[PDB]
Amino acid sequence: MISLIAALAVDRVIGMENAMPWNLPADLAWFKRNTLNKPVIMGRHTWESIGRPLPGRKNIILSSQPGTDDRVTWVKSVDEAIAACGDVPEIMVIGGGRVYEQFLPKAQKLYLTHIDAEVEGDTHFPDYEPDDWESVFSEFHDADAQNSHSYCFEILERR
Amino acid sequence: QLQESGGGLVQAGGSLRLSCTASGRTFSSYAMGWFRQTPGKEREFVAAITWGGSTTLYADSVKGRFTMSRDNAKNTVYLQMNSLKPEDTAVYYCAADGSQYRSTYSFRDKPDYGSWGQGTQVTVSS
Numbered sequence: 529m530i531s532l533i534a535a536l537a538v539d540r541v542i543g544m545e546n547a548m549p550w551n552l553p554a555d556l557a558w559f560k561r562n563t564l565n566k567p568v569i570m571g572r573h574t575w576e577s578i579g580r581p582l583p584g585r586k587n588i589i590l591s592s593q594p595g596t597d598d599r600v601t602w603v604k605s606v607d608e609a610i611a612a613c614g615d616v617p618e619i620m621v622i623g624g625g626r627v628y629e630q631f632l633p634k635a636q637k638l639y640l641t642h643i644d645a646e647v648e649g650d651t652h653f654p655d656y657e658p659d660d661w662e663s664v665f666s667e668f669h670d671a672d673a674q675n676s677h678s679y680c681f682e683i684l685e686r687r
Numbered sequence: 688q689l690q691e692s693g694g695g696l697v698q699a700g701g702s703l704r705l706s707c708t709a710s711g712r713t714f715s716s717y718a719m720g721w722f723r724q725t726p727g728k729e730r731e732f733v734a735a736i737t738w739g740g741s742t743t744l745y746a747d748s749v750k751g752r753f754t755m756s757r758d759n760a761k762n763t764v765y766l767q768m769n770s771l772k773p774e775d776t777a778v779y780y781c782a783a784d785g786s787q788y789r790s791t792y793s794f795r796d797k798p799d800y801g802s803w804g805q806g807t808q809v810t811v812s813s
Contacts, residue, residue, distance in 0.1 A: 538790040644739025678739030
């Protein structure tokens, strides 16, 4: 099955975490916990923003450009990224914006973290409608010493 | 499933505090807003706040006089109204966003309501 995992400010705004105006270690731990031991598919700018392969995961980079690191797998299309994952129970797509667009129609599961912030940006997670997605998990948290904003984890399943 | 309270008579220059309490487990995934309507006139946007309470938006007519706040543990939003004046006189209503996790701007500029309060009359003397 294919799943997307993303952190969304209000209005589904997304971005690179190292430039988002928040500190959310709890969400980063949520991400790691839900991606560990699974293939992760990411776009090139997401690759560059991370700066290193994610340990304990097969890293696949979807780009039209030739590869620049043998520690990860470089593919040129959505179908190739999927094929490169081989035979696994769950494929995690980790952005960014265009990658989320491309994979959403093939996905059965969403792991969303909603962040209580208004942040300007021209990139958004694609529209997911209640008609198509059943929310099967939600877990609300408030800001604290480590975490700058209210954040809510949500898992949805395609109806 | 919204219920306002507070309101009634206040002297000009005075303060009034409104609250809006909700029933329902999904309250804290929605933006909330305050509106005001006088008989036979337009309903007017007053304030909005995001789902988690951190971010607010106000009409220029109430900016710096009114504050909206939120307490998700109590499923409640509040409107603190200071420096009140006669033309603030109106029925005040709270409304829940019909769409989850939107900005204050989207709540105001792309209307979609899931729920409205019964309204509470606010009356400012002169």
